Amino acid sequence: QWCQPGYAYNPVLGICTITLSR
C-alpha cells in the first residue's frame, strides 16, 4: 500500500490513483 508522488491512495479502489487537487 504505497503511492508514488502525485498519486493519492484510494481505499475504495484499493490502488493508487493520480490526483491534481485542482
Swiss-Prot record:
<comment type="similarity">
    <text>Belongs to the O2 superfamily.</text>
</comment>
<protein>
    <recommendedName>
        <fullName>O2 contryphan Vc1</fullName>
    </recommendedName>
</protein>
<feature type="disulfide bond">
    <location>
        <begin position="3"/>
        <end position="16"/>
    </location>
</feature>
<feature type="modified residue" description="Pyrrolidone carboxylic acid">
    <location>
        <position position="1"/>
    </location>
</feature>
<comment type="function">
    <text>Unknown. Intracranial injection of the peptide into mice does not produce toxic effects. In addition, the peptide does not produce any observable changes to normal or depolarization-induced intracellular calcium levels in mouse dorsal root ganglion cells.</text>
</comment>
